[PDB]
Amino acid sequence: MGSMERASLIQKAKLAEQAERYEDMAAFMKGAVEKGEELSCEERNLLSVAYKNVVGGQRAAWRVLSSIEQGPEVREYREKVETELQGVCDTVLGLLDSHLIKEAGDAESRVFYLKMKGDYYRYLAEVATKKRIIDSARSAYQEAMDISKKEMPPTNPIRLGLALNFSVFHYEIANSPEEAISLAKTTFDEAMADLHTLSEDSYKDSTLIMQLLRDNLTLWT
């Protein structure tokens, strides 16, 4: 993508999203990041949707194959999909480390990128067989939590999605279901108390993510 204009990459990412061509969408957004300029809010969302969909298909496939696994063919093919998943997570982590996080000074950008760092170390942990990868996810989520608590209101959708994902990290990855349940409860309750401050459209944005926290609390208790 080095020969393509930044604006054309961004335009084609949006076309690829409409076409449900998520591998193309992630390749266009990788090329836009590698132009070296910081991303706007809408561009950071495009980067995240593209990779979420790519890695989401790889995670689903890896879970089907790992279940069948429980000749060498099932293990070889699960290994094949696992390696490709690890490569996509390494690519995202590499964009964050060169140089999205270091250039991100506003809280909205910095928390978004540190949450992504946590997420893609978490996806590495889901397949790992591990301590160091779990620690790297934890450390990224904790830095993002610290900034979000100081800099954003409790209803901010990035803060809420970070706390949701850190709660899933604690329940599924770190074997800390009580920490998961405490974080999801505290986050839901502090957001409920701040909803009165919001417009109708912001209220809809924040209550949609709060419902996910509640859906997990209903699964966990």
Binding site: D119, L164, V168, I209, L212, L219
Partner: peptide, 6 residues
């Protein structure tokens, strides 16, 4: 298993 953020 447990829904994460959109």
């Amino acid at each position: 298993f447990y829904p994460s953020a959109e």
